[PDB]
Amino acid sequence: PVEFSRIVRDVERLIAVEKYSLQGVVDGDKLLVVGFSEGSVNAYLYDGGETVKLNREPINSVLDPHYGVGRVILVRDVSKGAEQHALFKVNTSRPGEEQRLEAVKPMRILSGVDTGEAVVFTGATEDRVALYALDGGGLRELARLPGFGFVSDIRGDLIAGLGFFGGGRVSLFTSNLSSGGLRVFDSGEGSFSSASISPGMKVTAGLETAREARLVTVDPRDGSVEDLELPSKDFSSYRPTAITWLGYLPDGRLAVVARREGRSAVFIDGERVEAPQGNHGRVVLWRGKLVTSHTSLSTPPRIVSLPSGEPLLEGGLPEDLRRSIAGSRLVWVESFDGSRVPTYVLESGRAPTPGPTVVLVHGGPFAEDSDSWDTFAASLAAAGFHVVMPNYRGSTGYGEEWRLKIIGDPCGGELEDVSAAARWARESGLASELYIMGYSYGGYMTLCALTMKPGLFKAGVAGASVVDWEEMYELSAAFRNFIEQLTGGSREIMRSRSPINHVDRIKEPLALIHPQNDSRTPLKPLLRLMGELLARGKTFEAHIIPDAGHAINTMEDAVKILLPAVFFLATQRE
Amino acid sequence: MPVEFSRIVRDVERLIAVEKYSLQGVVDGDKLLVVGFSEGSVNAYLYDGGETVKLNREPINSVLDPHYGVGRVILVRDVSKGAEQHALFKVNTSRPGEEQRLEAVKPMRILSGVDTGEAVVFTGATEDRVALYALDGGGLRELARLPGFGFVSDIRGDLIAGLGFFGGGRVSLFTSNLSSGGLRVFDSGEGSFSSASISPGMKVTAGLETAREARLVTVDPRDGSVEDLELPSKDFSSYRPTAITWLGYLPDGRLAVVARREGRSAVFIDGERVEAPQGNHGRVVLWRGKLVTSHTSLSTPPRIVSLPSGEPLLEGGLPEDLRRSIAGSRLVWVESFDGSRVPTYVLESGRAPTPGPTVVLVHGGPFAEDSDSWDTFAASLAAAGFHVVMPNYRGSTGYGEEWRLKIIGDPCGGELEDVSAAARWARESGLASELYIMGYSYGGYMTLCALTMKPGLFKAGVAGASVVDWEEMYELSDAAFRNFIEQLTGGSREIMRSRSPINHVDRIKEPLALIHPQNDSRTPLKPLLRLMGELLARGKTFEAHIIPDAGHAINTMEDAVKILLPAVFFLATQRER
Ligand SMILES: [Cl-]
Ligand SMILES: [Cl-]
Ligand SMILES: [Cl-]
Ligand SMILES: [Cl-]
């Protein structure tokens, strides 16, 4: 019989576990870390096995400090739930004492850096998006931005950042601290992902293309772009597809974190440094040693030392639960047309082999299953399910060709990909029985699978799903454009690939989890689906929830959204 | 401030899992036949000498009443995933766990039955009729068609007696013959029959509930003559019961009666009162010369006890912590809109201050009652930090025929005023700091009835397995349930319409939580989907949980958790508001 209170207890601990991000080095030589829990967030100084809390009430984030600055700028929402933020300064020698920066009116704070002398940030109001500089003599608007924009780095008087200024791409920009203004460097056929200013006052940037990422140097004096050449060739030989973060360390070396196939690697002046398998955040130099953040499908975000990978700060889980979440691995699953589908697998320590296995389908579809911490997948492992996470075609992270294969073919090839992953789990000896679970586009897939491939999965869970493309099309500007694109402008594809037109074929129990009042995934089509299921005597469960937030932060959110799915699946295990 | 979810699940889990027992009879070689909720589902057991043996394999719904000593048991099991199309399965008491399906009986809604050992006699409902059946060597025979829901009470020789809801919410007595069939119906101008058993003299002894009192009568089935029955001890008559729960003749010819007043029952043999544990008792049987009954109370889950010692033969256990979350129970008489006094049980949470969060928990039926009897819902609420108020609105049993029959033709009328008065009482008495409403089946109907007709009374509502639309429900129901809907609404389509909460959604101003088993055929789902469309159309907030492969009669651990947990969670969240 299902141990319900165990599942809720575990889901509780996985939601509560503290999660850490590295922000920089301050106060001479202390780590600045932001720690997150149950969606609640604080700022800490770390040094030598101990933390000190800097803020009082929960915050939203902090600005990027320059190495060594004696203060930290907290960003905090001014109402509870509102886009308007205010800025609060804390001296690192007087933690817990906050001085509100009254010169900055509430607004949506998008990013920022604190040089120690000037606070430079981007913000959005009713009027505009702007770059601002706050110094001792008050607030100045350096520039108005033609879109959402983010400060990456300041060195001397030169400011660099990334802007979403049109054409579907991230462009690079620069400004001056003293004179302001804006210069935009267009990314051409790629997008800039990160930027840092060299001692030579060049902007080094990560340029992501259709295929392989490029490290480039951009001379801000003339807009010239050249591939950057590093003293060690490890980085180039790695052939990354994306660049997560880069920055110059105080001693002038360039730190870069790049990734491919859902895992990242750390490089210093092109030379690779050993790091724990997974994904890494920013790298800082601290008392002569290198420090980064780490996360994986089995490891909540934490701070590690390199190259040992020893944790400095990590949240606590009980011995019991840590052992439920075993290692993650990547496997390349072969699909119907021979194309290989990169699929992350998370093994449960609480399930034998072969054992119950969930194929957990990501939303988007323009998104990626990477080797990074996921409350959903971890909850499944804790409840005694292996989790299989396939990057079906349409996914990001593997080049433009793979992403664009979904166009005109929803519920076609990408379903074969998902189906091949399931097959792979059964025949590899991992799975004794197979389930499917997914949210948004993932829920659409779930319904797509149970209709077009009955007898493949034992049960399905569909969250925030879409049911009928044609009805959705006529009810939706932005989403109508998207639906047109995805279906190749074909009403025949809208109709044939809508699961509500094939309910008749479902042979397996289905669990629907849906928001009561969200215009993005509306409820009306789901009631029709439920009427159809009922009329045809199909087994189904439904949980309809008002006022769900689109991300699992708190225990409340988890209970509404995640818990019923895990319960349902545990009962299907009969 | 934040809802302690893991504590609630744990407590709810234990309160559902605790074993519960019901006494069904005596079989085989002087063995108790017991139905237990145990190991997570409803099962049938033989008890003898401090051990049980499980008779069935997969969970069952119930079993037929065995005659003393028969060598077999008839299991009743839903073969339609909750929709209550039942099939019958025979098990030889010497070969427990081996089931032979009785293929001559097509699936239908089994309402009751008795197994003489030679013939299985039962009542059932299909789409087109309610009937009395006999299954014997000659196959399946339809002894009679019944003009409504009907229940077999007893068989002695060829004579069959039972109770039938054959109109006006009155319960009549009927008889039939095993060999020849047919139907004879005996009405009372004074009241309703509640129970029946055939004497050795081939008279039917019956409990007759009148306006505000009950008593025992003898009915000669050869001429319909009714006489007050004279017992050798006067304890029973001095008790002045208001209702008669059960009666039966034991093998040695003594007459066993269980009668109640004010939500507690007493046991009588040939009129003489027998010491029994305070609460409510079920059937009495004679076993190894001693008397055995079932017992339950607001603090004691259903268990089997020996009388008069009251020593348990079978019971489940609760941890002390759970036991203490129920601080105390009491009966209070709440005054309603018309001066009628509404007997209302109150369960005070040990985990809530006074005044504190209080749920008005409305019982189903409506022909049923909140008594000093175990209630998983109520105990769960007390555990989660809610006082529970349980009003016996008009329509309830346990307080005379007049009180029961006031509901006829007036659903969502007076009985709502009764429920509303109880809520009022809890606030003004100092018990309640805030008020919630929660109910299942007719109780869920009342929840919807309250939130539509009395907005602003409750802070939030939970409606489980609810009635939504009497008309649509009428079209969807089987013979028996269609007849019953007719009776409750006084045959008025105007009442069906005006008293259906779906026609008043516009008036709802409070958060509503809907909980429904998908395959329920007493309270179907289809009208609920429409309600959800109505709520959505009218801009109301609500949450809904639809449970798969379950109908009205929840018989597993898993179904129970999925139906009860969301209710308690919802209410605890409404509290942190
Ligand atoms: Cl790891
Ligand atoms: Cl589990
Ligand atoms: Cl038979
Ligand atoms: Cl009364």
Three-state DSSP class for residue B5: helix
Query: Could you give the CA distance from residue A14 to residue B309 in angstroms, rounded to a whole number?
Result: 51
Q: How many CB pairs under 8 A join A and B?
A: 89
Query: Could you give the CA distance from residue B456 to residue B421 in angstroms, rounded to a whole number?
Result: 14
Q: How close A345 gets to chain B, by Cα (Å)?
A: 29
The CATH number of B18-317 is which of 2.130.10.150, 3.30.460.90, 2.60.130.10, 2.40.110.10?
A: 2.130.10.150
Query: Could you give the CA distance from residue B49 to residue B67 in angstroms, rounded to a whole number?
Result: 21
Stated as kind and residue range, the H or E segment containing A556 is: helix A555-561
CATH class of the domain comprising B318-577: alpha beta
Flag if A547 and B536 touch (Cβ within 8 Å): no
Count of CB atoms within 10 A of residue A492's CB?
9
Question: What are the beta bridge partners of residue A255?
Answer: A247, A268
Query: Could you give the CA distance from residue B461 to residue A255 in angstroms, rounded to a whole number?
Result: 58
Catalytic center residues of A: 440, 518, 550
Task: Give, as residue ranges, everything with CB less than 5 Å from ion ligand 2.
Answer: A 383-384
Q: Are strands A299-306 and B432-440 parallel, antiparallel or unpaired?
A: unpaired
> Considering only CB atoms, which residues of chain A are within 8 Å of chain B?
1-2, 4-5, 8-9, 12, 509, 511, 516-517, 523-524, 527, 530-531, 534, 539-547, 555-556, 559, 564, 567, 571
Query: Could you give the CA distance from residue B304 to residue B319 in angstroms, rounded to a whole number?
Result: 19
Flag if A509 and B542 touch (Cβ within 8 Å): no
Closest Cβ opposite residue A542 in set B6, B39, B544: B544
Structure determination method: X-ray
Query: Could you give the CA distance from residue B306 to residue B287 in angstroms, rounded to a whole number?
Result: 9
Query: Could you give the CA distance from residue B391 to residue B370 in angstroms, rounded to a whole number?
Result: 7
Closest Cβ opposite residue B541 in set A516, A555, A559: A516
Q: Which of the ligands is closest to the CA of residue A295?
A: 1
Contact residues, chain B, for A534 at CB < 8 Å? 518, 525-526, 529
CATH number of the structural domain A317-574: 3.40.50.1820
Instruction: Judge whether B259 and B243 are in contact, CB under 8 Å.
Output: yes
Nearest C-alpha neighbor of B538 from the set B512, B513, B507, B500: B507
Count of CB atoms within 10 A of residue A400's CB?
12
Going from N- to C-terminal start, the domains of chain B cover 18-317, 318-577
Flag if B2 and A534 touch (Cβ within 8 Å): no
Instruction: Judge whether B317 and B360 are in contact, CB under 8 Å.
Output: no
What letter would DSSP give residue B506? Answer: G
CATH class of the domain comprising A17-316: mainly beta
Residue of B nearest to A574 (CA): B558
Contact residues, chain B, for A5 at CB < 8 Å? 6, 9-10, 13
Three-state DSSP class for residue A404: helix
CB burial class (10 A; 0-12, 13-18, 19+) of residue B181? middle
CB burial class (10 A; 0-12, 13-18, 19+) of residue A49? exposed
Q: How close B112 gets to chain A, by Cα (Å)?
A: 27
Contacts of A292 (CB under 8 A, 6+ apart): A22, A257, A266, A275, A280, A281, A282, A283, A284, A303, A304, A306
Residue B293: both structure tokens together = 């009954």
Q: Which of the ligands is closest to the CA of residue B335?
A: 4
DSSP A68-136: T-SEEEEEEESSSS-S-EEEEEEETTSTT--EE-TTS-SBEEEEEEE-SS-EEEEEE-SS-EEEEEEET
Q: How close B131 gets to chain A, by Cα (Å)?
A: 27
Closest Cβ opposite residue B529 in set A5, A531, A564: A531
- How many Å lie between the centroid of ligand 3 and the Cα of residue B66? 13
Could you confirm whether B520 is annotated as catalytic? yes
Task: State which amino acid sits at residue A58.
Answer: P
- How many Å lie between the centroid of ligand 4 and the Cα of residue A434? 58
Instruction: Judge whether A26 and A113 are in contact, CB under 8 Å.
Output: no
Residue B179: both structure tokens together = 């060999």
Nearest C-alpha neighbor of A158 from the set A134, A141, A182, A174: A174
- Token look-up 């971890």 returns A378
Q: How close A533 gets to chain B, by Cα (Å)?
A: 10
For the stretch B481-511, what's the b/e string if a residue is b when 16 or more beta carbons lie within 10 angstroms of its beta carbon? bbbbbebbbeeeeebbeebbbbbbbeebebb
Query: Could you give the CA distance from residue B84 to residue B551 in angstroms, rounded to a whole number?
Result: 7
